[PDB]
């Protein structure tokens, strides 16, 4: 490549590794594949970024929320349970750790692990309390793709927090185990469990 030297001392791991191919800090958003063609153009993995801490403008129309690079929406739902509202630097730190741990536990592309988990884990029906008149009847309903990826992101992060809450096994570890056992149909990860529950109650109530 012949990386350039200059009056500034910047390392070749900064420049030559990441100039001319702008992957990520490592583990590219390039050569990536979505499994099912219902997450195509609802999950913007078409462009690589470096850090999911971009000052998002994306709720300010209806559907621009779909064009956040999905690491952003993962780390943006990572800031819940009240006392961790607005702690975005810690949230991106946790995402970096759990992707490194995904890299350790599986030599596959961690972003591929995450997006394939989203595909495997998004609930594809819903039950909805409809009144009509009387005593709270339920109805099955199909789900929007964007609502599906909404529900899936929420499920993965929720299972991560509630598992690692009183437990010494840290949040990156539990999130990565959720990602592995969500990528595979393990039925040992919470989000796969709840996908089974909602689709089961839809199958009952339809």
């Amino acid at each position: 490549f012949t990386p350039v030297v200059l009056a500034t001392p910047i390392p070749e791991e900064v420049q030559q590794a990441q100039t001319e191919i702008k992957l990520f800090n490592k583990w590219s958003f390039e050569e990536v594949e979505v499994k099912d063609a219902s997450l195509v153009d609802y999950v913007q993995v078409r462009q690589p970024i470096f850090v999911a801490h971009t000052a998002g403008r994306y709720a300010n129309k209806r559907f621009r929320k779909a064009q956040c690079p999905i690491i952003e929406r993962l780390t943006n739902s990572l800031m819940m349970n009240g006392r961790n509202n607005g702690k975005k630097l810690k949230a991106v730190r946790i995402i970096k750790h759990t992707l490194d741990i995904i890299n350790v536990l599986t030599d596959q592309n961690p972003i591929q692990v995450v997006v394939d988990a989203i595909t495997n884990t998004g609930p594809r029906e819903d039950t909805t309390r409809v009144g009509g008149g009387g005593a709270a009847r339920r109805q099955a309903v199909d789900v929007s793709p964007l609502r599906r990826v909404n529900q899936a992101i929420a499920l993965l992060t929720i299972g991560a927090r509630e598992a690692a809450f009183r437990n010494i096994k840290t949040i990156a570890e539990t999130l990565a185990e959720e990602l592995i056992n969500a990528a595979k149909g393990s039925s040992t990860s919470y989000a796969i469990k709840k996908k089974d529950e909602l689709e089961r109650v839809a199958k009952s109530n339809r």
Partner: protein
């Protein structure tokens, strides 16, 4: 319900069973073997020092050790 001091027996169990893993952190160490965390971090410093495992991502909140080979 964990341990808090060494015995040279669980020490050798670390010496054998940590290279069986390819992912090492204090919490997975004290979940598999029986340590109270702080001694696991002492063990992680020792297994970084005498190279038996591989730090890839050290952070004061969280260290990620892995298989050397």
């Amino acid at each position: 319900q964990h341990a808090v001091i060494l015995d040279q027996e669980k020490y050798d169990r670390i010496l054998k069973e940590v290279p069986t893993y390819r992912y090492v952190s204090v919490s997975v160490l004290v979940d598999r073997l029986k340590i109270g965390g702080s001694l696991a971090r002492i063990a992680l410093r020792h297994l970084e020092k005498e190279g038996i495992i591989k730090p890839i991502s050290k952070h004061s909140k969280q260290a990620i050790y892995t298989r050397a080979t």
